[PDB]
């Protein structure tokens, strides 16, 4: 169906830095009848079930801090974390729901040493 | 003031079809006879697999009164692929919007749906059928590859149409581009020539259209209703279009250049949700050779002295001036929730006075909400705000209001007398009714007194029978009449002359006719129309001072005239009417000195 | 010519005299003072009529906190607070919704949402004293969807206001209809696009708590809507989250007895909106007269607590309890040819004036 | 609060069939569809299937047909994923989930090992 390409596979950060990661769809995820982009971002900490951060490209989920900002449209979407915390070291995934649900490979955040 | 509401032609269609939903006239260039076009959008057709497809019927008038369907489309739903339909004609509302230019009939189906080739969907794109000569083609300006909400997928093309005198089709498609709305205008020749039944999306070369705009214009429904006329002096009819939900639901009317679609003018409503722009029309209503613009706003609420808002309906009337400026006045309706202004139909010069007249409906007004049509006469200063004639619906509601006046068309003369007639739909009862315009007679009535000054001692003539000497004066009167259209050569008039009537009933009248010894006289007069004034002279005398209330008073000399109405009729039984803007009561004064 | 004010025991606590009888002749006039005295601690009926199209799911989830928190705050404004609930989306016809066989039941294409079938208006919960029941009805509310931006708000409002026997509106209460949305509403003539050409008759059409004329009758006009809201003594509060708030705000002058506020982007002020709107509505007193008597005209001037005068239905503002507002009512006869009703907008009590005539 | 409780770890030989349950609570079972997601032991998430808990009609991803089946026991608010003819490639953690934005949820993840 729709293949989601996520990049990079791994990104090292230092606490306090601004980190960005992106995901490119195979087709438009924009529903002309709603004007919404059907893409969501998930956070998965190792050993735990994943959690939804952002839906519809930029709508933030309840319980999620505002350091997590989503943006993008059409095929090109970005997740940016402002002042990344040590607690944000997790694998992030992009998901589309334009057609059948599908996930990208995921981006693992690592800590710089 | 001259419509015949006593002997109208009544037509009817199948129950529940909404026969009369939309009306127009059909006038072939050289068939010698004319037909009425009456739509019936929910009619059950004979098409193989289509439910309530809708149809347009051609109705006769001379002799009997019968309607028959026009076979614009005699097939079913064409397939895209085996067991996969391309198009959905059931409930398409064909006949919802019908217009005709001479031989050319354009009938639309605003709720027509199709799947598009890209994906198996059902979008309300809308199509029209254009018939001329013996050929019929399908015109589907929004059935393109620009699909879905951001495209023309929800266009509903054909929702409202008109014709351009240049032989172009003006089509409104209010749902295009997130319901911003779109106007599409093309040539008749292109529509007819570039046609192939195996092609679903057809491009035309001389097509004009509006384009997309910012989201701020979403849900405006541009092209909800259209009209044409020259608003820039270029000799090319321009395009007038209602946009009822524009400008934060104030409503707007746009005028686009008929040659290149550059915008020329922008009219705005004053009140939110008045739905200004529901209907538009253009005509010269003041004899200035410039088209004037009539804009309806059927939900307008007119605030009273206590601050109460009454929903009545309003029509904005603006006159076009040479500078490009418009002079705007406002006409309010007469009844609450009648929705005055929901339908505007130029009648042409209904009363042949040199100025065009116009009909404005209020479909839910009158007793029992049968519906009313108001006829307003024109003049050099703009439309006369006071209606001259009121037409009421003649049928009871069966499940819904007859909505008499919902759709109207005038400026076509069917009975061929020079005075254009008016077709009024009443779809709630599946009927349509044609009101014909009566001939108008202008009357020149003269009255003179010879001399106006006399006295009781000025004995100048003798009485009949016994030659007693009395004071006398002569009263002359005369009458000439004519019309502009087809009128009987001989006009049969009734006249009455009264003397000294300005007093208490039972009082002594001093000025009497010599031969009858009476204050009154009447005569049967035959006036050739366009002929000489027919004159008569009666001799009056004064009673002497033995029988009086006073000696020194004014003497009124009063003349009244009217038509016979027994011999005054044409071959259809249509009677002429006297001009209602002139008095039929005139007077002169004589005095005793 | 005279004016008689009954000395019989009154049956009204807010509007008095509740019955007046006058005798007129053409060219004559008579008058009286009408007193309106707002009460404290009213029984209050609050019905939540909510837009449940997909764009609203963010606000709907907050109605779970509203039940108990609003009930507590209202304890200082009311005596008996009841909650009800219903929802609306749009008219279930083309072009407003998809009519594709595979997407009729699920209008949305977002595969993360098992969205509800579209509907015009559905009544969910009758007005009740039970807060838990309200919260339960809200919790289980599913989100729907449609295609065109505008929503069928005004059509749902009329039914909610008119169908008294289904909603359970009390006469002995301040009736509040709260409408939640983010988008503007459809107008009566917009329905032509769907092939609906039959005017709303203003009646109640509910079956199993569902509006069933939603696909055959058009949307009510503002004229019809205000007429029914006033006739049924229902005060309306609009709660709008989007920029469209201003659209609703600017319709307030056309809809007497209506107030509007904004929902914050976080939708954290739903209770403050209701309480503030309530306090504002209770502080404004204005009257209108329903005059069906031919040949009779009325001129009413409000006399406010600060001595100012405000004509007609402009009324008085910053009015409290233990604060009477006077209305100077003059009735005049112009011509020869029943009764008229003078009532505060949003109040249950009315003053009926009988007009006897001779010529 | 919505919770999803899955069965414990399963150990199967090649060719054997495993049935993995997911019990729902905190909401009406038939209100939301139940999604299944496969996480290979070191790879990203792959959506497998969804079942509409109201009708029992499943939808599958292109890569998971034939060997996968989904069923309901609505009387016990439980959804099941059945995997037939297990191969070594099917070793993974299988999650059940609800993606409704207002109230999403995930199970703890059922660990399935194929020898
Ligand atoms: C009757 O009333 C109507 C309105 O109801 C009015 O028509 C509108 O006219 C305005 C212009 O005055 C249209 O707005 C835009 O006009 C520009 C033309 O250039 C002017 O504006 C730009 C920008 O401010 C100036 O720099 C320039 O010097 C001129 O003043 C068009 O180029 C605009 O096109 C946009 O849409 C296109 C696709 O639809 C895009 O391809 C294009 O790039 C533009 O996109 C814009 O919006 C994007 C967001 O959606 C944004 O990302 C882009 O960067 C960019 O800003 C546009 O047409 C307005 O659309 C007209 N509206 C309608 C409904 O037609 C009539 O003129 C008036 N008539 C009379 C007689 O009074
Ligand atoms: C056109 O034909 C249809 C089909 O017979 C008519 O609709 C039916 O009306 C009867 C009587 O109320 C119902 O019992 C059927 O269930 C209806 N069928 C469908 C498919 O709607 C329709 O009324 C006819 N319309 C006109 C104008 O004659
Ligand atoms: C208010 O409503 C709640 C919810 O319906 C009622 O609590 C329920 O009571 C029944 C017994 O009649 C139990 O079987 C349910 O499990 C209870 N539900 C919950 C959520 O606790 C409560 O009794 C009602 N109270 C009043 C005064 O009407
Ligand atoms: C209008 O509302 C008031 C409440 O504000 C009603 O007055 C109450 O009526 C009940 C029933 O008779 C009494 O038990 C209360 O004590 C009354 N309250 C007060 C403050 O006096 C009033 O009856 C309602 N009007 C109508 C016509 O129903
Ligand atoms: C209520 O209105 C009446 C008028 O309808 C006021 O009565 C008039 O008062 C003025 C000033 O003293 C006199 O000149 C008039 O002759 C009075 N009128 C009539 C119509 O007979 C009355 O004072 C007003 N009451 C209040 C409280 O403002
Ligand atoms: C349309 O034609 C008129 C002719 O007077 C011209 O002035 C105007 O600039 C033209 N507009 C466009 C967009 O071609
Ligand atoms: C009604 O009263 C106002 C004063 O508040 C006055 O200005 C207005 O002219 C009066 N109207 C009539 C019709 O008497
Ligand atoms: C007017 O309203 C304000 C609140 O906005 C209040 O503080 C003030 O006391 C009010 N004035 C009177 C005279 O009641
Ligand atoms: Ca022109
Ligand atoms: Ca003119
Ligand atoms: Ca004329
Ligand atoms: Ca004629
Ligand atoms: Ca909608
Ligand atoms: Mg919505």
Summarize the structure.
With 593 residues, chain B is mostly beta strands. In chain B, strands 35, 37, 38, 40, 42 and 44 form a 6-stranded mixed sheet that branches. Chain B has a 5-stranded mixed sheet with strand order 36-45-43-39-41, with no helix packed on it.
Topology:
The complex is a heterotetramer of chains A (113), B (593), C (359) and D (115).
Chain A: E1 5-7, E2 10-13, E3 19-24, E4 30-31, E5 36-37, E6 39-44, E7 51-55, E8 59-60, E9 68-73, E10 76-81, E11 91-96, E12 102-103, E13 107-111
Parallel strand pairs in A: 2-13
Antiparallel strand pairs in A: 1-3, 3-10, 4-5, 6-7, 6-11, 7-8, 9-10, 11-12, 11-13
Chain B: E1 3-12, E2 23-26, E3 35-40, E4 55-59, E5 67-69, E6 79-81, E7 84-85, E8 87-88, E9 97-101, E10 104-109, E11 113-114, E12 127-132, E13 135-139, E14 160-164, E15 168-173, H1 176-179, E16 182-187, H2 188-193, E17 208-209, E18 225-229, E19 238-243, H3 246-249, E20 252-256, E21 263-268, E22 280-283, E23 292-297, E24 301-303, E25 309-311, E26 314-320, E27 326-332, E28 343-348, E29 357-362, E30 372-376, E31 389-392, E32 408-412, E33 421-426, E34 431-437, E35 440-450, E36 453-454, E37 459-462, E38 469-482, E39 490-499, E40 511-513, E41 520-528, E42 534-542, E43 554-563, E44 577-578, E45 585-592
Parallel strand pairs in B: 35-44, 36-45
Antiparallel strand pairs in B: 1-34, 2-3, 3-4, 4-5, 6-7, 8-11, 9-10, 10-12, 12-13, 14-15, 15-16, 16-17, 18-19, 19-20, 20-21, 22-23, 23-26, 24-25, 26-27, 28-29, 29-30, 30-31, 32-33, 33-34, 35-38, 37-38, 38-42, 39-41, 39-43, 40-42, 43-45
Chain D: E1 3-6, E2 10-12, E3 18-25, E4 34-39, E5 45-51, E6 58-60, E7 68-73, E8 78-83, E9 92-98, E10 105-106, E11 110-114
Parallel strand pairs in D: 2-11
Antiparallel strand pairs in D: 1-3, 3-8, 4-5, 4-9, 5-6, 7-8, 9-10, 9-11
The complex binds a molecule of 6 linked components (NAG-NAG-BMA-MAN-MAN-MAN), a molecule of 2 linked components (NAG-NAG) (4 copies), 2-acetamido-2-deoxy-beta-D-glucopyranose (3 copies), calcium ion (5 copies) and magnesium ion.
The site of a molecule of 2 linked components (NAG-NAG) has 4 residues of chain C, from helix 3.
**Number of DSSP strand runs of chain C:** 16
State the order of secondary-structure elements of chain C, H for helix, E for strand: EEEEEHHEEHHHEHEHEHEEEEEE
At the third CATH level, what is the topology name of the largest domain in chain C?
Rossmann fold
Class of the largest domain in chain C, according to the CATH hierarchy?
A: Alpha Beta
The count of helical stretches of chain A stands at 0
How many domains, in number, for the residues of chain C? 2
Work out the radius of gyration of chain A.
13 Å
Query: From the coordinates shown, what is the CATH architecture of the largest domain in chain C?
Result: 3-Layer(aba) Sandwich
For the CA atoms, what is the radius of gyration of chain C?
Answer: 22 Å
Beta-strand residue percentage of chain A: over 45%
Q: Looking across the biggest beta sheet of chain C, what order are the strands in?
A: 7-6-5-8-9-10
Strand content of chain C: 25-35%
GO molecular function (chain C): extracellular matrix protein binding; integrin binding; metal ion binding
GO cellular component, one term (chain C): cell surface
Subunit structure (chain C): Heterodimer of an alpha and a beta subunit. Beta-8 (ITGB8) associates with alpha-V (ITGAV) to form ITGAV:ITGB8. ITGAV:ITGB8 interacts with TGFB1.
Family (chain C): Belongs to the integrin beta chain family.
């Amino acid at each position: 169906d729709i293949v989601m390409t996520q990049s990079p596979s791994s990104l090292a950060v230092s606490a306090g830095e601004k980190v960005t990661m992106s995901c490119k769809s195979s087709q438009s995820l924009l529903n002309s009848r709603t004007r919404k982009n059907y893409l969501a971002w998930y956070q998965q900490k190792p050993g735990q079930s994943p959690r939804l951060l952002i839906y519809w490209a930029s709508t933030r989920e309840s319980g999620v801090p505002d350091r997590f900002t989503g943006s993008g449209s059409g095929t090109d979407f970005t997740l940016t974390i402002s002042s990344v915390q040590a607690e944000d070291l997790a694998v992030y995934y992009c998901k589309q729901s334009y057609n059948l649900l599908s996930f990208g490979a995921g981006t693992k955040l690592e800590l710089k040493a | 003031f001259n419509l015949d509401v006593d002997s109208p032609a009544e037509y009817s269609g199948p129950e529940g079809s909404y026969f009369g939903f939309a009306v127009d006239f059909f006038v072939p260039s050289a068939s010698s006879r004319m037909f009425l076009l009456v739509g019936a959008p929910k009619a059950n057709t004979t098409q193989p697999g289509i439910v309530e497809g809708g149809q347009v019927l051609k109705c006769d008038w001379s002799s009997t009164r019968r309607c028959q369907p026009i076979e614009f489309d005699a097939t079913g739903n064409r397939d895209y692929a085996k067991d996969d339909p391309l198009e959905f004609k059931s409930h398409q509302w064909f006949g919802a919007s019908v217009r005709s230019k001479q031989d050319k009939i354009l009938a639309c189906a605003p709720l027509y749906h199709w799947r598009t080739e890209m994906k198996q969907e059902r979008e309300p794109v809308g199509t029209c059928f254009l018939q001329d000569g013996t050929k019929t083609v399908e015109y589907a300006p929004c059935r393109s590859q620009d699909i879905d909400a951001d495209g023309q997928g929800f266009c509903q093309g054909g929702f409202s149409i008109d014709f351009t005198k240049a032989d172009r089709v003006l089509l409104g498609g209010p749902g295009s581009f997130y319901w911003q709305g779109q106007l599409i205008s093309d040539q008749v020749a292109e529509i007819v020539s570039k046609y192939d039944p195996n092609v679903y999306s057809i491009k035309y070369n001389n097509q004009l259209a509006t384009r997309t705009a910012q989201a701020i214009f979403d849900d405006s429904y541009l092209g909800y209703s259209v009209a044409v006329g020259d608003f820039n002096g270029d000799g090319i009819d321009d395009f007038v279009s209602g946009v009822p939900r524009a400008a934060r639901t104030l409503g707007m009317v746009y005028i686009y250049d008929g040659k290149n679609m550059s915008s020329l003018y922008n009219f705005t409503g004053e009140q939110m949700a008045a739905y200004f722009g529901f209907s538009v029309a253009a005509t010269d209503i003041n004899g200035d050779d410039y088209a004037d613009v009539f804009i309806g706003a059927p939900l307008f609420m007119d605030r009273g002295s206590d601050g109460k808002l009454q929903e009545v309906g309003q029509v904005s009337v603006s006159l076009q001036r040479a500078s490009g400026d418009f002079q705007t006045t406002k006409l309010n309706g007469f009844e609450v929730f009648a929705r005055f202004g929901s339908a505007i139909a130029p009648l042409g010069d209904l009363d042949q006075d040199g100025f065009n007249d116009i009909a404005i409906a209020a479909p839910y007004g009158g007793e029992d909400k049968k519906g009313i049509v108001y006829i307003f006469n024109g003049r050099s200063t703009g439309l006369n705000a006071v209606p001259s004639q009121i037409l009421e619906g003649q049928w009871a509601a069966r499940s819904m209001p007859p909505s008499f006046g919902y759709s109207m068309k005038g400026a076509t003369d069917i009975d061929k007398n020079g005075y254009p007639d008016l077709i009024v739909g009443a779809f709630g009862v599946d009927r349509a009714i044609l009101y014909r315009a009566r001939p108008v007679i202008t009357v020149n009535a003269g009255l003179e007194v010879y001399p106006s000054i006399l006295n009781q001692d000025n004995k100048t003539c003798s009485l009949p029978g016994t030659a007693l000497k009395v004071s006398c004066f002569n009263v002359r009167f005369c009458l000439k009449a004519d019309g502009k259209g087809v009128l009987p050569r001989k006009l049969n008039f009734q006249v009455e002359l009264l003397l000294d009537k300005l007093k208490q009933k039972g009082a002594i009248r001093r000025a009497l006719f010599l031969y009858s010894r009476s204050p009154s006289h009447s005569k049967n007069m035959t006036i050739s129309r366009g002929g000489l004034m027919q004159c008569e002279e009666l001799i009056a005398y004064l009673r002497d001072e033995s029988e009086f209330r006073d000696k020194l008073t004014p003497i009124t000399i009063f003349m009244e005239y009217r038509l016979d109405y027994r011999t005054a009729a044409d071959t259809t039984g249509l009677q002429p009417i006297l001009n209602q803007f002139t008095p039929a009561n005139i007077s002169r004064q004589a005095h005793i000195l | 010519v005279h004016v008689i004010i009954p000395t019989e025991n009154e049956i009204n606590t807010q509007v008095t005299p509740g019955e007046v009888s006058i005798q007129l002749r053409p060219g004559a006039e008579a008058n009286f003072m009408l007193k309106v005295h707002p009460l404290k601690k009213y029984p209050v009926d609050l019905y939540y009529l909510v837009d449940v199209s997909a764009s609203m799911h963010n606000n709907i989830e907050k109605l779970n906190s509203v039940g108990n928190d609003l009930s507590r705050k209202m304890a200082f404004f009311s005596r008996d607070f009841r909650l009800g609930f219903g929802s609306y989306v749009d008219k279930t016809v083309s072009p407003y919704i998809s009519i594709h066989p595979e997407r009729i039941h699920n209008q949305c294409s977002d595969y993360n949402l098992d969205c509800m079938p579209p509907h015009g208006y559905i009544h969910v919960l009758s007005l009740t004293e039970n807060i838990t029941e309200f919260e339960k009805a809200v919790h289980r509310q599913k989100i729907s969807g449609n295609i065109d931006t505008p929503e069928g708000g005004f059509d749902a409002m009329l039914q909610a206001a008119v169908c008294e026997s289904h909603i359970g509106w009390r006469k002995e209460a301040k009736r509040l209809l709260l409408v939640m949305t983010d988008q503007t509403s459809h107008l009566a003539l917009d329905s032509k696009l769907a092939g609906i050409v039959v005017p709303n008759d203003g009646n109640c059409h509910l079956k199993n708590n569902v509006y069933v004329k939603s696909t055959t009758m058009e949307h009510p006009s503002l004229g019809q809507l205000s007429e029914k809201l006033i006739d049924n003594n229902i005060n309306v509060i609009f709660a709008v989250q989007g920029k469209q708030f201003h659209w609703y705000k600017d319709l307030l002058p056309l809809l007497p007895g209506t107030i509007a506020g904004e929902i914050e982007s976080k939708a954290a002020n739903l209770n403050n909106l209701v309480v503030e709107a309530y306090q504002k509505l209770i502080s404004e007193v204005k009257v209108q007269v329903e005059n069906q008597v031919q040949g009779i005209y009325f001129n009413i001037t409000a006399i406010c607590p600060d001595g100012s005068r405000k004509p007609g239905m402009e009324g008085c503002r910053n009015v409290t309890s233990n604060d009477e507002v006077l209305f100077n009512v003059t009735v005049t006869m112009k011509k020869c040819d029943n009764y008229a009703i003078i009532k505060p907008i949003g109040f249950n009590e009315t003053a009926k004036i009988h007009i006897h005539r001779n010529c | 609060q919505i919770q999803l409780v899955q069965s414990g770890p399963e150990l199967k030989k090649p060719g054997e069939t495993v049935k993995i349950s997911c019990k729902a609570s905190g909401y009406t079972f038939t209100d939301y569809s139940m999604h299944w997601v496969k996480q290979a032991p070191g790879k990203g998430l792959k959506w497998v299937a969804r079942i509409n808990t109201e009708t029992g009609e499943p939808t599958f991803a292109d890569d998971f047909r034939g060997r996968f089946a989904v069923s309901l026991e609505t009387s016990a608010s439980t959804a099941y994923l059945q995997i037939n003819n297990l191969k070594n490639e099917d070793t993974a953690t299988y999650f059940c989930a609800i993606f409704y934005y207002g109230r999403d949820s995930w199970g703890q993840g059922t660990t399935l090992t194929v020898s």
